Amino acid sequence: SARISLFAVVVEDMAKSLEFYRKLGVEIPAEADSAPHTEAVLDGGIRLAWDTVETVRSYDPEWQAPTGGHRFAIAFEFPDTASVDKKYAELVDAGYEGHLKPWNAVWGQRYAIVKDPDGNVVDLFAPLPLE
Amino acid sequence: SARISLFAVVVEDMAKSLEFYRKLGVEIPAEADSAPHTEAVLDGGIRLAWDTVETVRSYDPEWQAPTGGHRFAIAFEFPDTASVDKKYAELVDAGYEGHLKPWNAVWGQRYAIVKDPDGNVVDLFAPL
């Protein structure tokens, strides 16, 4: 039986994408900026990977950047409301797109949304245990 | 302080999506087919989630089904190489999109690529 081993995102610029994720706590060496493909190991073993458009086209020649609504989102968990809000402001202050400012979501979590350098949706959240 | 916790995909049809993933060994309750949101816990606690387009258009009324290549891919590892070819044939027979047929990738893996019901790329692999 199969098991999910890795998740990957296609990036226009490796260095630019990597710096955004480093800002979200993902451990990535600076040296990876010059790589056509980068992988980071998440807690538990699953990997998050980045492949440049050229790398993708090496085996998937007809690949074209999609237009329209996002097909997915990557959600990061924080310990509390303070850390979520602080990170949102930090990312926006760093030049990244703040899509939806922090709010208390009906499902019981402090929630916020930003976009990565490639325009992908990234959620920031923390539980609201008092609810 | 921050850690990746979830990877979510937008589905036009929850049932159609979930049945594809159940075919890849993802344990998903049958009643999740009628839910606007579904989650499955993977190795280490990270979750794969599904959200209907309506759920999505809630906080994004503009959302329009995209077209084009993937910006995101999910890679499934298999116990052996024969399992990769077998699963690829099965999924294609089930009516799913076979993108790139099995081959011995230069990085040292039997590799194959299909697309899920919503256009997301799914890699099938096993070490050579």
Confirm or reject contact between B24 and chain A (CB < 8 A). yes
Q: What is the 3-state secondary structure (H, E, C) of A30-93?
A: HHHHHCCEEEEECCCCCEEEEEEHHHHHHHCCCCCCCECCCCEEEEEECCCHHHHHHHHHHHHH
Buried b (16+ CB within 10 A) or exposed e, A61-81: eebeebeebbbbbbbbbbeeb
Q: How far is A66 from chain B (nearest CA, A)?
A: 4
Q: What is the resolution of this structure in A?
A: 1.4
Distance (Å, whole) CA A45 – CA A53: 25
Domain that holds residue A33: 1-131
Distance (Å, whole) CA A58 – CA B60: 34
Distance (Å, whole) CA B35 – CA B18: 11
Tokens representing A3?
Answer: 């098991």
Cβ contacts of B53 on chain A, cutoff 8 Å: 69
Find, in chain B, the residue whose alpha carbon is nearest to that of A120: B71
Q: What is the DSSP letter of B95?
A: T
Tokens representing B62?
Answer: 């503009």
Residue A94 half-sphere exposure, CB side, CA atoms within 13 Å? Answer: 18
DSSP per residue, B11-37: ES-HHHHHHHHHTTT----GGGGG-SE
Question: Which one, of B95, B102, B96, B92, lies nearest residue B123 by Cα?
Answer: B102
Number of domains into which chain A is organized = 1
Distances (CA, A) of A67 to A26, A58, B56: 27, 21, 17
Among residues 48-67 of chain B, which lie with CB inside 8 Å of chain A? 48-49, 53, 56, 59-60, 62-67
Confirm or reject contact between B26 and chain A (CB < 8 A). yes
Name the residue with tokens 């890849």: B24
Distance (Å, whole) CA A46 – CA A81: 27
**CATH number of the CATH domain containing B98:** 3.10.180.10
Distance (Å, whole) CA B90 – CA B124: 12
Cβ atoms of A14 and A32 within 8 Å: the answer is: yes
In chain A the first and final C-alpha atoms are separated, in Å, by 39
Distance (Å, whole) CA A7 – CA A48: 5
| Largest CA-CA distance found in chain A, in angstroms, rounded | 51
Cβ atoms of A122 and A24 within 8 Å: the answer is: yes
- Sheet order of strands, B97-105 included: A37-41, A47-52, A3-11, B72-77, B121-127, B109-115, B97-105
Residue A25 sits at φ, ψ, to 5 deg, of 90, -5
Task: Region of B25 please: left (phi>0), alpha (psi -120 to 50) or beta.
Answer: left
| CB within 8 Å: A74 and B6 | yes
Confirm or reject contact between A12 and chain B (CB < 8 A). no
Cβ contacts of B64 on chain A, cutoff 8 Å: 68-69
Find, in chain B, the residue whose alpha carbon is nearest to that of A46: B43
Question: Which one, of A87, A74, A68, lies nearest residue A115 by Cα?
Answer: A74
Q: Which residues precede chain breaks (C–N over 2.5 Å) in chain B?
A: none
